[PDB]
Design a protein around this ligand. Sequence first.
Ligand SMILES: Nc1ncnc2c1ncn2[C@@H]1O[C@H](COP(=O)(O)OP(=O)(O)O)[C@@H](O)[C@H]1O
Lengths: 527, 61, 68, 250
Amino acid sequence: LPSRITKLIKKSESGDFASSYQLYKVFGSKEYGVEPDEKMSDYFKELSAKQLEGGQLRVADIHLENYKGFESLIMDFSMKKNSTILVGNNGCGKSTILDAIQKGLTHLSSRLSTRSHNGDGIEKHELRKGQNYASIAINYDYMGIRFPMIIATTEPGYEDRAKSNYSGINELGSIFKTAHSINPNVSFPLIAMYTVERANDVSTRDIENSEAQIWDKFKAYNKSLTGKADFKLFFRWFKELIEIETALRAEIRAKEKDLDNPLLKALLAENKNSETTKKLLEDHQNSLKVLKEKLNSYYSVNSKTLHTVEDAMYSFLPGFSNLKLQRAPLDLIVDKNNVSLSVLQLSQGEKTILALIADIARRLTLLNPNSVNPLDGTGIVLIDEIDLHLHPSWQQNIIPRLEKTFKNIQFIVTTHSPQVCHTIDSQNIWLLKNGQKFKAPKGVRGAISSWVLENLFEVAQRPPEDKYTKLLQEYKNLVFSEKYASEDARKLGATLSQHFGPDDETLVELKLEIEKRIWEDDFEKDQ
Amino acid sequence: QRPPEDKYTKLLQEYKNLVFSEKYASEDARKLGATLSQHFGPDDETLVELKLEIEKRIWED
Amino acid sequence: YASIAINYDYMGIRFPMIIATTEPGYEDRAKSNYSGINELGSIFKTAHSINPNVSFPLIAMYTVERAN
Amino acid sequence: LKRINKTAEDQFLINFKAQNPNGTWDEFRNHEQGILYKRLKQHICNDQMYLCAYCEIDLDRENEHEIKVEHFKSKNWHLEWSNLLAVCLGGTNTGDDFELPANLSCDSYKSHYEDKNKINDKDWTGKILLPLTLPDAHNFFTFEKVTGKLLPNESYCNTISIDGKPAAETLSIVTKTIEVLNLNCSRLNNARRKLLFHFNNCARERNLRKLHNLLLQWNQGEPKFFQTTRDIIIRDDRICQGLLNGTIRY
Ligand SMILES: Nc1ncnc2c1ncn2[C@@H]1O[C@H](COP(=O)(O)OP(=O)(O)O)[C@@H](O)[C@H]1O
């Protein structure tokens, strides 16, 4: 064995998964003239299974051929920075790349927490119209090692070189499986893709259906790469966690049956003038209120490790506190500016952000069983149309806080607004042109939104159709056309000064130019 | 218009106020000038304005 | 108590409306009234009766649920 | 193009020329840790007064990573003195080559246009203006005050010859120069517009003393960035000409 092998072994002894897997590959082949011995390969695999403190699993590159509407879109997602903004246009193919990654990622999600090998391939409506050689190839990247994977399809009447491999991800699944059964507390990779279908978020259909499972690690992968932030699962987790802490419930059952008897209704209808009975009815309603208040007071006292998850959703929505539910007819209660109110009546964007953050936090806490800081895990989260229901105040803040609350999470997202796409550095935002990928020009990390719109989205800051815009254009043409006072500059100035106002940094400059021109015709009189 | 909490935006503000005040050409003027010229490009709106005015009021001195 | 009032306009002639509710523990202090919308419906129905091809207004809202 | 004054030939360039008569620019840059490379870069930039060749932007005094060296003829031209020039970054160096066109300014747009046009003849001499051969005072590029886009002047082009070519086609050469070097991008147009802004601002008071101060500050002293725009503004304005020739006194 060469001294390089000994150096690699020594490096791997000091907690280095990269060296362990390199020696595994060397033992599995004839690299560096090393004799093939599966025994030392198994020993190296066992050593590597104990070295998975965290690798920040990414997606690195992507290779698409004749998929959706693209022909060849080799793209390199960022590795040193945990963000990527896919800007594109409406109809250029933003969701194409994200959909390709989620079809690739379903196989990975299966091979983490399932058995067997199940995954989805290219369907009939996904193949490009004209050719049949479709293939998705996403090269994953663990801490120092890469696993190829190609998803391919071929029409029955032809045979292209679309040989689907699935060669690499099997090794990743195997190493995670081996590492799981030595210490049942491991930081499993997170997988989640979130479409625009989260708009139909929290509603009565989930809360009212509340009326068990121990929340194992292999759960949170379930129903993750679907495209909706299911509040029903979060509500069930909330109930299950807080139930860890009957006569009143039995009393509620008995009082409901007694007060709803048909005989009581008939007696009430027979004698409308029942003030003496009305007093007893109001006493019963007071007992109702007292019992419900006591049952709810048996709740809003203490909490558990759920507090860390709760702190994640109070940061994205300022002015929100005291999130509990009600042991009366089921509902979830927030407090907004000292106004306690139900979750079902929150704003659309507020509910969207709440459901999104709650779902991600639930996933992160279920994957990480025992950690001092469960909320900063390793995984991949995909968001489609992040600016769907958000005010511009939250648009320039959504991502910088998202990268801070969740640290080691990749956030490949698609945007449709300049405000959100000017908080990310220019080298990590991708523009999809008609058919090719282009990089943004320098000066986006802290530039003005107008500049971003003008040189990243190809849109004028002034609508090039309105009457007032055309009038301003004619005015700016006339001021510099050697006739600064030929009665039409006068008319248009009298119009625009009254419209925009005498104090705006578009007409103040041009009026200053007019004043300079007025001065220029004073000393020339003697000439 | 610009980010309310961004490191480069804070550098822009810390450059602009020093341009319009003491320390027009000192310890930090050149270094922030170079840092904000590497990004945003060396040819934009705000920085050319600031450079022109610093040239004007260093010529006056 | 809550109350919503809307005034509908047609050719400079206006139709009143008010829709209200009261919690069932206190005597209602705002009763519903639909005086003008019955008027408008009757006018349009009579116009249809005399002539089957009289143009009618369009009423519709498109909620965010049109995403899917 | 403000035009530069090519100084006398330096010694270490000749020393590197002697050792390898057939060598590339990368060979000169890599050899001896690039000490001679940055020495030659400093020589060329000091000759040029730290202003961009075709783009006219304030090249950084301290950091030398913001300055690139390119050749008028596409890259033995790699060693000839009549080919080396110093240019701006062009908006690149954040990426490598996968950047949106129609925004690049100085030289990276030149390479992009060369590749997408498939121009076999890399000798741009006689096709676009060469800063070395330009006269000290040239009218040429005029610009409208609306958008700030520099445009050729037919009157002055029709009465001068450039690059050993007939004077009839000089206007075509200037238009080709504009097209290849992309001298009408948004950033440079905005810079010219704000140069006009700062020329106009001091003129509100009509204080001829401060106006003469502006003329002395621009025309005299070491040349500054966008020198062509300053010259065009000064010549175009009648009162500036009257102040320069002594018609107006304060
Ligand atoms: N069989 C096909 N052939 C060619 N193009 C297709 C085919 N199927 C889908 N597409 C393309 O898919 C595009 C849909 O865009 P999409 O990926 O949803 O991104 P976004 O919704 O952000 O605009 C369309 O522009 C369409 O041209």
